């Protein structure tokens, strides 16, 4: 496994493009099975 730890290079990346999630905290269980 060894997914507990990460690297310095991939931890210090503020600028990483991603999608947008409103996260209203009221809509069901959000992604549900994903996380």
């Amino acid at each position: 496994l060894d997914s507990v730890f990460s690297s310095s290079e991939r931890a210090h990346q503020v600028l990483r493009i991603r999608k947008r999630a409103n996260s209203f905290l009221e809509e069901l269980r959000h992604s549900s099975l994903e996380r």
Partner: protein
């Protein structure tokens, strides 16, 4: 006779003494509306247990042997094994069915209530207002005499067959719904709701299409969505009670709840509120609806004659009040006072305070705050060697709500402390660095990144000292920043940052993100490149071109917070897009007959579309084929009939219910008759997961 008597239903002299108050709160009333509401609530919760409580997904949430970090309200609570959890959910289902059919009503209510609150308190990441409401309604209905009309207990027991109920049974529910509407409305008198920031992008939905024939998008997003919602909350609270306003209030409330059901994915909240809306009507509306039907149908619907006397009421001839009447009145008054007080009880339990107020779930502040997280770093220092390492942001977790609350952060730190020694880490010191913006503000730290949360101090009744204040001074900037957001190309992207005095941010620009620049908006910062150890002090309105592939630090050296921005474009994505576009242009030229010269051999697979009897395609060709396939799939999805979607939805829900039932059966069999050999278990688990078709 009095005008107040007809408007409010009770006279002032009734409040002179305790005896008169008890008599008023225990006067006879018809049971029909309460019975209908009981039936609808039970049925909806029966449908909701396999969907939102998580009985379908319970086998991958409480899996045995897996180490995960839990977030219970009390540290004493611990989940049971999976099979006993399945048994608990079976007890919930039995209680809900009993409530629906009115069979052993008090026992069924208790069997639903206690498990539901156990599940609710076991996890703080699954809290929302519409679960708290279900818990409250189940608690209230445990004491109400709702099994008098359209109940199996009536058939099995003559004394409870179409009998009277006291008046506070309706009063408590009406007060609860009024509290929900009014407190939701007043909580929405916030600067970010009246100004159009919360739910700023919800006016694009096609349900708002007719409004766009008369109003622009920006005006529709403010007059209708925000001010309309606030006014609807307050007015729907007040109007439904009065006789004159009931029709218009019912129409607006029903439209509001249907639009909420379609626009959001809240779940069964809209249907529950719709079922509660008739409760403000006369206590005997179902009876007169039943009467206005053919006699043959009336042979199947419930009784229509006048209800018989009950012993849960006080009649005026008289009858001195007993004990249960006094307890009912006291319960009504104290419960409604507690309901009014609890949403504003945040100055006593100050440990849970943050930028927002209190834990989410019992404040009725629905859809008021939206958050966008930009970065999360978890650093650990080993307690023996001194080595410094970095963990994944969300390891040993199932939700992402730990990023915004101090108590959950403390629990997560303790969980990591107990788990990490399994991975050759001695007594660790964990530091957290989380960047979040609420309602489109500057991204700022929420927690102090120099504090070891494992050893930090937290108590519920004292304020945490390691939660950064919300810089509300930068509120007006949200206008200007948005302008900069709209001045960009289809490639450029912008991130805004506001940083405290003394602190610094160390960042690593990826090799792909060429052409990245930093500009200063307010304050004073110094930018250090560590490859050659060179720091330049930036003044307001100065820009620098950062390296790609190196570390750079930004330090704040002013007494007040400093605001700056990163503007970047992805070079690799742009290059891939340009090369793919050139390839597509060549393909189109080949298709229309142009480019008479021979195609390159790598282009032959593109025209063929299948990698058979030839060299493997280059990664660019694979990307092109994948893009074409995805575009075809999206186009096929768009040109899809509605009936197919409806049938697929029905099949998916059927699959969910089937999986829930079969897994519960497996668990109960294991509990009672023991566990078979592993092969039979594997066969059964394969059988349960099979799609219905």
């Amino acid at each position: 006779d009095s005008r107040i008597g007809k408007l409010l239903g009770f006279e002032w002299t009734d409040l002179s003494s305790w005896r008169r108050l008890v008599t008023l709160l225990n006067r006879p009333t018809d049971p029909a509306s309460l019975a209908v509401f009981r039936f609808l609530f039970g049925f909806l919760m029966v449908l909701d247990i396999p969907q939102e409580r998580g009985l379908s997904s319970l086998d991958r949430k409480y899996l045995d042997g897996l180490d995960v970090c839990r977030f219970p309200l009390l540290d004493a609570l611990r989940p049971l094994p999976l099979d006993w959890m399945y048994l608990v959910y079976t007890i919930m289902f039995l209680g809900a069915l009993g409530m629906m059919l009115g069979l052993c009503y008090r026992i069924s209510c208790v069997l639903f209530l206690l498990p539901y609150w156990y599940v609710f308190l076991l996890d703080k990441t699954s809290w929302n207002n519409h679960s708290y409401l279900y818990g409250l309604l189940a608690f209230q209905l445990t004491f109400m005499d709702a099994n008098h009309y359209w109940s199996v207990d009536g058939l099995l027991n003559a004394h409870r067959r179409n009998a009277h109920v006291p008046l506070w049974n309706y009063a408590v529910l009406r007060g609860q719904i009024f509290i929900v509407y009014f407190i939701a409305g007043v909580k929405k008198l916030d600067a970010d709701w009246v100004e159009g920031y919360s739910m700023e992008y919800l006016s694009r939905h096609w349900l708002f299409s007719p409004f766009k024939l008369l109003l622009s998008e920006e005006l529709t997003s403010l007059l209708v969505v925000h001010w309309g919602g606030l006014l609807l909350d307050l007015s729907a609270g007040f109007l439904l009670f009065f006789d004159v306003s009931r029709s218009i209030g019912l129409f607006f409330v029903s439209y509001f709840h249907c639009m909420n059901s379609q626009l959001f994915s809240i779940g069964m909240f809209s249907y529950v509120m719709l079922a509660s809306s008739p409760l403000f009507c006369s206590p005997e509306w179902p009876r007169k609806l039943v009467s206005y039907c053919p006699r043959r149908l009336q042979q199947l619907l419930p009784l229509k004659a006048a209800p018989q006397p009950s012993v849960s009421c006080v009649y005026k001839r008289g009858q001195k009040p007993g004990l249960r009447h006094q307890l009912g009145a006291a319960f009504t008054l104290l419960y409604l006072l507690e309901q009014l007080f609890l949403p504003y009880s945040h100055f006593l339990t100050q440990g849970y305070n943050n930028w927002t107020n209190g834990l989410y779930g019992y404040s009725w502040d629905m859809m008021v705050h939206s958050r966008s997280h930009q970065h999360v770093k978890i650093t650990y220092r080993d307690g023996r060697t001194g080595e410094l390492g970095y963990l994944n942001p969300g390891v040993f977790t199932q939700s992402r709500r730990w990023k915004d609350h101090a108590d959950m952060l403390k629990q997560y730190a303790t969980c990591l402390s107990r788990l990490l020694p399994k991975y050759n880490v001695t007594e660790p010191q964990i530091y957290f660095d989380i960047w979040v913006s609420i309602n489109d503000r500057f991204q700022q730290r929420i927690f102090d990144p120099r504090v070891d949360i494992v050893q930090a101090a937290w108590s519920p009744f004292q304020r945490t000292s390691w939660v950064q204040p919300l810089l509300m001074d930068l509120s007006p900037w949200r206008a200007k920043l948005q302008e900069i957001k709209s001045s960009l190309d289809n490639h450029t992207e912008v991130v805004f940052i506001a940083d405290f005095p003394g602190l610094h941010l160390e960042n690593f620009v990826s090799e792909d993100l060429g052409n990245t620049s930093i500009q200063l908006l307010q304050g004073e910062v110094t930018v250090e490149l560590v490859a050659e150890q060179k720091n330049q002090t930036l003044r307001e309105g100065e820009k620098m071109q950062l390296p790609a592939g190196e570390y750079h630090k930004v330090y704040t050296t002013s007494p007040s917070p400093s605001c700056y921005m990163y503007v970047y474009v992805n070079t690799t994505e742009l290059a891939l897009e340009q090369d793919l576009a050139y390839l597509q242009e060549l393909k189109e030229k080949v298709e229309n007959g142009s480019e008479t010269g021979p195609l390159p051999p790598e282009l032959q697979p593109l025209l063929e579309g299948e990698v058979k009897g030839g060299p493997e395609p280059t990664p660019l060709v694979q990307t092109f084929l994948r893009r074409q396939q995805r575009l075809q799939e999206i186009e096929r999805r768009r040109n899809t009939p509605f009936h197919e979607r409806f049938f697929r939805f029905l099949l998916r829900k059927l699959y969910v219910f089937r999986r829930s039932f079969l897994m519960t059966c497996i668990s109960l069999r294991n509990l009672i008759l023991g566990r078979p050999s592993l092969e039979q278990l594997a066969q059964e688990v394969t059988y349960a997961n099979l799609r219905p078709f």
